[PDB]
Amino acid sequence: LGKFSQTCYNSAIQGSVLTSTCERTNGGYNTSSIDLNSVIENVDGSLKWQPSNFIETCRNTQLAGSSELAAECKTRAQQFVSTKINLDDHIANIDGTLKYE
Amino acid sequence: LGKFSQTCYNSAIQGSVLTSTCERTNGGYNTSSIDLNSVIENVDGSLKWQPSNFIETCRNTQLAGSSELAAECKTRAQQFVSTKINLDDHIANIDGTLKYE
Ligand code: NA
């Protein structure tokens, strides 16, 4: 559904970063931001949205230790198996901000 | 390339969201989060990092109007052309916080 600009203002892009000042559900405001590097993609010169399947096919997410993600996900033979990934692998700290590279 | 957890503490995974409080470059701290649904994916049951080429093949990004990304991207034949996309198609404000949905 999207529609952020409807309830936001003073938006800006910088590199692939988007930042805006957005209304709460109460009456105040907050300034967040999203990296668009992992959400849009370039196909022959045109931008498109990227598909994803983590929220929709995996479950019961958890952090083990300092940088290990753990969950259970759905296979091709449509059964849930246990899987794990080191988030240190590609998640970095870039001046107090968490960044995917 | 990566290894955030050597300057971050108190990390937490909730849903697809990772949250951590990190070491600013000077001496201080900042608490961030990154939505992993667009960073990792599941391939037959196993979680894999997702590749993407936007900032790697595109340049000169601009917010045009209220909600439109504009940029120039390289076509398979290595030529920069024009390309826009409406961010409001999937960027949302969830309680003062921008989300991709
Ligand atoms: Na992605």
UniProtKB/Swiss-Prot annotation, chains A, B:
SMART domains: CVNH. SUPFAM superfamilies: Cyanovirin-N. GO terms for biological process: regulation of defense response to virus. One of its GO terms (molecular function) is carbohydrate binding. Cleavage, or reduction and alkylation of the disulfide bonds results in the loss of anti-HIV activity. Overexpression of this protein to provide quantities adequate for medical use as a topical microbiocide has been attempted in a number of systems including E.coli, Lactobacillus jensenii, the yeast Pichia pastoris and Nicotiana tabacum; see PubMed:20162270 for a review. InterPro entries: Cyanovirin-N (IPR011058), Cyanovirin-N_sf (IPR036673). Disulfide bonds join C8-C22, C58-C73. Keywords: Antiviral protein, Disulfide bond, Lectin. Belongs to the cyanovirin-N family. Its activity in situ is unknown, however it acts as a viral entry inhibitor, inhibiting HIV-1, HIV-2 and simian immunodeficiency virus (and some other viruses such as feline immunodeficiency virus, measles virus and human herpesvirus) infection and replication. It prevents essential interactions between the envelope glycoprotein and target cell receptors by binding to carbohydrates on viral protein gp120 and possibly by other mechanisms as well. Addition to cells must occur before or shortly after virus addition. Mannose-binding lectin. In solution exists as a metastable domain-swapped homodimer which very slowly converts into a more stable monomeric form at room temperature. Under physiological conditions it is unlikely that the dimeric species exists and indeed the monomer is more active against HIV. Interacts with HIV-1 gp120. This is Cyanovirin-N. It comes from Nostoc ellipsosporum.
